[PDB]
Amino acid sequence: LTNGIEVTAYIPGIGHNLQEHSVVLIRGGRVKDLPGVRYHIVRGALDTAGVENRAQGRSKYGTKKPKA
Amino acid sequence: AVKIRLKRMGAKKSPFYRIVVADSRSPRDGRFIETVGTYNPVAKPAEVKIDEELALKWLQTGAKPSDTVRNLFSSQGIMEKFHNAKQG
Amino acid sequence: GPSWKLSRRLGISLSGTGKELEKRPYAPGPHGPGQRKKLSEYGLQLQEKQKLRHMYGVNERQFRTLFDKAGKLAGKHGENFMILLDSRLDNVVYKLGLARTRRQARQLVNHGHILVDGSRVDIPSYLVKPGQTIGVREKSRNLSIIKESVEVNNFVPEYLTFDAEKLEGTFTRLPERSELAPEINEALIVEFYSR
RNA sequence: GGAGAGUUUGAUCCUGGCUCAGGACGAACGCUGGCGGCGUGCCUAAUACAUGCAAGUCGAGCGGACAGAUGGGAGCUUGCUCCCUGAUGUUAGCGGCGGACGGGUGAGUAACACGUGGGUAACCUGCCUGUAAGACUGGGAUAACUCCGGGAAACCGGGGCUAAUACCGGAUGGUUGUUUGAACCGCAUGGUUCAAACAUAAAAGGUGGCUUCGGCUACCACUUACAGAUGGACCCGCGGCGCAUUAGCUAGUUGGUGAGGUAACGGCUCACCAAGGCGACGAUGCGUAGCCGACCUGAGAGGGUGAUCGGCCACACUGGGACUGAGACACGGCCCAGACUCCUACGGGAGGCAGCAGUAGGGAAUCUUCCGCAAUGGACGAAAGUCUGACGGAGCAACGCCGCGUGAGUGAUGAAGGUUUUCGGAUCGUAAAGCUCUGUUGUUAGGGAAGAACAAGUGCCGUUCGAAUAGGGCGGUACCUUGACGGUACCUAACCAGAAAGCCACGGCUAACUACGUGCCAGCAGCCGCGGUAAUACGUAGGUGGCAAGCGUUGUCCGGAAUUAUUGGGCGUAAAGGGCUCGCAGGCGGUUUCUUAAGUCUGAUGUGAAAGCCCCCGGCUCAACCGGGGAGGGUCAUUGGAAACU
């Protein structure tokens, strides 16, 4: 982060977009199943483009409305 | 320095005023000692309501108002009752 | 909305008709003729609230505060909230008969201009007190919406004094809940919005 | 004016956790988004700032410059050139007052800073009224002006000229101090009043009129005194934090005397002399933070926060000092150093946005480099006026609340199409089409508020001074005149279904389900937990449901959480009795009676400003908002009652 603290976060989407040295915005989300990670990555950030071909769950996972 | 004066209240477009005995050193919405009644500009009719007696006690102590405040007292004869007291 | 597809969900002719229950009492949908189940109190008190709020199309930001505006009112809080949403000006237009639906009464307030003791009122949610007169100026004096609904001579409620061509509307002491709601059960919406 | 629900288990009750429904944001993010009022909009960086503006005002304080042409006269080209001081105009400087308020920010500060109630015999207060008195007689400068000199500039130095309501003496004065008397009273210092004596202590003119030219007069300013009005300073009880894994801390500390010093009390400063003071009711220390009316939440008791608007303190790049002024240790003043920026001809200087905007930078993240002094306000002036980034409005972002839409009636054929299917059908359903419909708004053209009250100048009448019917002063009324927003709100008529809906959920919590895809993989997940081939829990489609110009997620705080339990728990085994004693401090008290009034009870009075909550009206097309009136809020203080209980 920009605090200086290196905390392992989680990638939610159906496949990722991120590579090293990216812009990652983090909301507070508890993952019960995985040991130690308590941070989602906001799919739909400044760098995270939205997941491919998603209609339901539009606000989450950063996809625009496909075509109207 | 002690000017009996108006005090700006109300919404953005349509103002409201309260006639206020205060010190001029405090700001336009600043503090005060004791007030007299009201003023309404946004009514095309009347309803400028004054206590009409309490300020005369303050005028005997001496507190000069601005003329835009003062001519409301002329419309209800506070100053002319006070000028009779100055002629008394 | 559709204003009729939502009442078959409630399973009642909310304006009061013989239609919208014939041939299809199952509520909407493909899971309609698949036989329904029995709900909970939370299942009931939604529909019991929604059998009153879909009468008038009130969005629930405006439905909550009128419940709170009944809170400061004296009397029993259930029957107080019955008074405010039948002193609704949308309902007053519909109870004077010139609207076949309460949704038709919304344009009869919005741009089918109408005069409450003066200039005009474009407010579908004006709280109406006894002692007010309602009329329409010559700009929309007799249009076919009014002309057909004058000819649809429905029964006049007994808290209203209404003439057809004179078009004036005044009141009595209150609209009485015995006259107002035959279908809607009260005292359940209060226990909905107390929680 | 007080809802609960899933989860330990094979099954049950407890116990105990967390989870969940709710309510707010100065909130951000994702997706979308038509409009209108009202309100907010750098919390991190009190980090650095390009550019412009944010505080001047008086020619009626004053000298001079500065234009001026009422005329006068001159030289002639008829084109001019002048020489006098017209009306009047300009104000570098001088001097008067303001700049100490208005405005912002939240860094330090855990203490009389603030909140509340107090006390001053221990104080101050220019500008305000009202009263009491007045305003005598002189003096010496000096800026500007020029004339030189030195400087790159910043600017500086020298020599003459000159003014004032500038400055400085002399008089007279009910200040004050001293000296000596009296009177009265308080709360010790004492206080108040009166007399005498001594000592000094002032002031100013200007504006206009009337003039006998001596002056007079109003008005403004001036010196002094009294009060009131006015704010400020100092002191004091009582309040609102975190840690004992901070128990010892302070020598001007704590005392006295005298001295100085401060508007004022004082170790406030210093000498002397004394050894005290602060402390288990938590000192000292440390981390933390501006406080308060209030905001949010809770059913209340409480808990959280202290943003905007209103009170007060503190700070003005970091630090220290100090002047003039009634008032500062001065936000846009000086002097010094520290960092940094800028300029220099290197000798030298200038600079301070946490003023309005804007930019950098920080960060998840917060707006326009507009117009107006029309209203309110201040500043000065006799006023007009001038000056106003206070304020007035416009502009930005769904940031939030409220308000309005996105068509509406009729219409069965259950159209078409879509989805599903036991292929009969089912649903998307009166939903569309059709017919009818108005125009909020959208669009076009018109009309066009209140905010604006005035000042000022004119008119009178009254009163007041006046040598006066001069001439004013106020007081009344009468005429005149003044809009940034803005032709904006608004209203009038004309136009079209035409401009305009979405996100979230759909096993149980929790309202709502099927079909395909899929096969511990891809993926959901707040909770229990869902998928190793029939996923109502993943993804998609249809269809529902949720709410709406918004919806979800996110971080916060409160609630449900009776899960820190005073109201409102426990302790046999569930978390919990110290291993047991002797006991200082603190805690609690038999019976009867007198008395007292600290607690308690209660009246009265004073006060807890306003806005906000709340009671009730009224205003804005309702609402939101705004206004009027009232209540309420204090372990408050004084005073007077009550005597059972402590």
PDB file of C-alpha atoms (C1' of nucleotides) in Angstrom, chain D residues 70-179:
ATOM      1  C1'   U D  70     -14.805  84.071 -14.197  1.00  0.00           C
ATOM      2  C1'   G D  71     -12.859  87.863 -16.520  1.00  0.00           C
ATOM      3  C1'   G D  72      -8.449  91.275 -16.924  1.00  0.00           C
ATOM      4  C1'   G D  73      -4.320  92.541 -20.183  1.00  0.00           C
ATOM      5  C1'   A D  74      -0.281  91.345 -23.863  1.00  0.00           C
ATOM      6  C1'   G D  75       2.162  89.752 -28.840  1.00  0.00           C
ATOM      7  C1'   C D  76       0.654  88.669 -33.509  1.00  0.00           C
ATOM      8  C1'   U D  77       0.084  84.334 -38.070  1.00  0.00           C
ATOM      9  C1'   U D  78      -6.511  84.694 -37.048  1.00  0.00           C
ATOM     10  C1'   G D  79      -4.144  80.631 -36.245  1.00  0.00           C
ATOM     11  C1'   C D  80      -2.641  81.129 -31.625  1.00  0.00           C
ATOM     12  C1'   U D  81       0.877  82.184 -27.711  1.00  0.00           C
ATOM     13  C1'   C D  82      -0.157  83.972 -22.775  1.00  0.00           C
ATOM     14  C1'   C D  83       0.055  86.359 -17.633  1.00  0.00           C
ATOM     15  C1'   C D  84      -3.154  87.257 -13.521  1.00  0.00           C
ATOM     16  C1'   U D  85      -6.157  83.282  -9.452  1.00  0.00           C
ATOM     17  C1'   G D  86     -12.603  81.815 -11.567  1.00  0.00           C
ATOM     18  C1'   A D  87     -16.054  78.397 -10.076  1.00  0.00           C
ATOM     19  C1'   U D  88     -14.121  74.041  -9.226  1.00  0.00           C
ATOM     20  C1'   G D  89     -11.068  69.674  -9.906  1.00  0.00           C
ATOM     21  C1'   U D  90      -6.527  66.039  -8.584  1.00  0.00           C
ATOM     22  C1'   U D  91      -4.408  64.346  -3.958  1.00  0.00           C
ATOM     23  C1'   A D  92       2.877  62.156  -3.576  1.00  0.00           C
ATOM     24  C1'   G D  93       3.678  63.936   1.451  1.00  0.00           C
ATOM     25  C1'   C D  94       2.068  65.818   6.172  1.00  0.00           C
ATOM     26  C1'   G D  95      -1.320  65.061  10.181  1.00  0.00           C
ATOM     27  C1'   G D  96      -6.275  62.542  12.482  1.00  0.00           C
ATOM     28  C1'   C D  97      -8.675  57.825  13.237  1.00  0.00           C
ATOM     29  C1'   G D  98      -8.953  52.819  11.471  1.00  0.00           C
ATOM     30  C1'   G D  99      -5.551  48.574  10.364  1.00  0.00           C
ATOM     31  C1'   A D 100      -6.106  44.781  17.466  1.00  0.00           C
ATOM     32  C1'   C D 101     -12.516  44.129  14.170  1.00  0.00           C
ATOM     33  C1'   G D 102     -14.473  41.739   9.919  1.00  0.00           C
ATOM     34  C1'   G D 103     -12.013  36.416   7.632  1.00  0.00           C
ATOM     35  C1'   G D 104      -9.507  31.602   7.982  1.00  0.00           C
ATOM     36  C1'   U D 105      -7.028  27.216  10.025  1.00  0.00           C
ATOM     37  C1'   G D 106      -6.891  23.218  14.306  1.00  0.00           C
ATOM     38  C1'   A D 107      -0.737  22.824  15.181  1.00  0.00           C
ATOM     39  C1'   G D 108       0.343  23.061  20.260  1.00  0.00           C
ATOM     40  C1'   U D 109      -2.173  23.289  24.979  1.00  0.00           C
ATOM     41  C1'   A D 110      -5.248  17.817  30.042  1.00  0.00           C
ATOM     42  C1'   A D 111      -5.061  23.910  32.266  1.00  0.00           C
ATOM     43  C1'   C D 112      -9.203  28.484  35.505  1.00  0.00           C
ATOM     44  C1'   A D 113      -8.089  27.245  27.942  1.00  0.00           C
ATOM     45  C1'   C D 114     -13.205  26.158  27.966  1.00  0.00           C
ATOM     46  C1'   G D 115     -18.489  24.982  30.334  1.00  0.00           C
ATOM     47  C1'   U D 116     -21.235  26.565  34.628  1.00  0.00           C
ATOM     48  C1'   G D 117     -22.015  29.469  38.976  1.00  0.00           C
ATOM     49  C1'   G D 118     -19.310  33.236  41.590  1.00  0.00           C
ATOM     50  C1'   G D 119     -16.242  37.317  43.723  1.00  0.00           C
ATOM     51  C1'   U D 120     -13.212  42.144  43.066  1.00  0.00           C
ATOM     52  C1'   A D 121     -12.767  47.038  48.763  1.00  0.00           C
ATOM     53  C1'   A D 122      -7.689  44.510  43.383  1.00  0.00           C
ATOM     54  C1'   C D 123      -8.761  46.505  37.770  1.00  0.00           C
ATOM     55  C1'   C D 124      -9.232  48.959  32.595  1.00  0.00           C
ATOM     56  C1'   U D 125     -12.188  50.909  28.693  1.00  0.00           C
ATOM     57  C1'   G D 126     -10.546  55.944  22.631  1.00  0.00           C
ATOM     58  C1'   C D 127     -14.810  55.638  19.438  1.00  0.00           C
ATOM     59  C1'   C D 128     -21.516  56.216  22.945  1.00  0.00           C
ATOM     60  C1'   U D 129     -24.981  59.171  25.267  1.00  0.00           C
ATOM     61  C1'   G D 130     -26.282  62.384  29.458  1.00  0.00           C
ATOM     62  C1'   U D 131     -24.581  66.000  32.924  1.00  0.00           C
ATOM     63  C1'   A D 132     -20.792  69.236  34.760  1.00  0.00           C
ATOM     64  C1'   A D 133     -17.093  72.622  33.214  1.00  0.00           C
ATOM     65  C1'   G D 134     -14.521  74.663  29.584  1.00  0.00           C
ATOM     66  C1'   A D 135     -11.555  76.050  25.776  1.00  0.00           C
ATOM     67  C1'   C D 136      -6.131  81.836  27.984  1.00  0.00           C
ATOM     68  C1'   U D 137      -0.798  83.408  26.152  1.00  0.00           C
ATOM     69  C1'   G D 138       3.353  82.158  23.345  1.00  0.00           C
ATOM     70  C1'   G D 139       7.353  79.258  21.289  1.00  0.00           C
ATOM     71  C1'   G D 140      10.709  76.276  18.217  1.00  0.00           C
ATOM     72  C1'   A D 141      10.761  72.882  14.197  1.00  0.00           C
ATOM     73  C1'   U D 142      10.138  69.742   9.709  1.00  0.00           C
ATOM     74  C1'   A D 143       8.324  66.611   5.656  1.00  0.00           C
ATOM     75  C1'   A D 144       6.545  67.520   0.994  1.00  0.00           C
ATOM     76  C1'   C D 145       9.141  71.348  -1.938  1.00  0.00           C
ATOM     77  C1'   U D 146      13.580  72.100  -4.281  1.00  0.00           C
ATOM     78  C1'   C D 147      19.557  71.992  -4.524  1.00  0.00           C
ATOM     79  C1'   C D 148      23.601  68.752  -4.512  1.00  0.00           C
ATOM     80  C1'   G D 149      25.899  64.091  -3.034  1.00  0.00           C
ATOM     81  C1'   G D 150      26.039  58.531  -2.818  1.00  0.00           C
ATOM     82  C1'   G D 151      23.895  54.102  -4.812  1.00  0.00           C
ATOM     83  C1'   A D 152      22.941  48.444 -10.222  1.00  0.00           C
ATOM     84  C1'   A D 153      18.608  48.698  -7.758  1.00  0.00           C
ATOM     85  C1'   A D 154      16.593  48.587  -3.019  1.00  0.00           C
ATOM     86  C1'   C D 155      17.081  53.624  -2.058  1.00  0.00           C
ATOM     87  C1'   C D 156      20.028  56.679   1.107  1.00  0.00           C
ATOM     88  C1'   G D 157      22.775  61.271   2.749  1.00  0.00           C
ATOM     89  C1'   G D 158      23.622  66.540   3.078  1.00  0.00           C
ATOM     90  C1'   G D 159      22.068  72.353   2.513  1.00  0.00           C
ATOM     91  C1'   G D 160      18.105  75.844   2.494  1.00  0.00           C
ATOM     92  C1'   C D 161      12.201  77.047   2.153  1.00  0.00           C
ATOM     93  C1'   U D 162       7.170  75.893   4.787  1.00  0.00           C
ATOM     94  C1'   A D 163       2.513  74.547   7.028  1.00  0.00           C
ATOM     95  C1'   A D 164      -1.290  72.819  10.202  1.00  0.00           C
ATOM     96  C1'   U D 165      -6.991  70.199  14.710  1.00  0.00           C
ATOM     97  C1'   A D 166       1.436  68.381  14.096  1.00  0.00           C
ATOM     98  C1'   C D 167       4.866  69.261  18.053  1.00  0.00           C
ATOM     99  C1'   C D 168       6.575  72.216  22.803  1.00  0.00           C
ATOM    100  C1'   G D 169       6.297  76.055  26.931  1.00  0.00           C
ATOM    101  C1'   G D 170       3.218  79.974  30.438  1.00  0.00           C
ATOM    102  C1'   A D 171      -1.650  80.759  32.957  1.00  0.00           C
ATOM    103  C1'   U D 172      -6.356  78.846  35.064  1.00  0.00           C
ATOM    104  C1'   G D 173      -8.700  74.271  36.438  1.00  0.00           C
ATOM    105  C1'   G D 174     -13.452  69.967  41.359  1.00  0.00           C
ATOM    106  C1'   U D 175      -7.743  64.806  38.146  1.00  0.00           C
ATOM    107  C1'   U D 176      -4.104  62.847  41.304  1.00  0.00           C
ATOM    108  C1'   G D 177      -0.584  62.707  45.220  1.00  0.00           C
ATOM    109  C1'   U D 178       0.982  64.614  49.832  1.00  0.00           C
ATOM    110  C1'   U D 179      -0.290  66.814  54.882  1.00  0.00           C
TER     111        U D 179
END
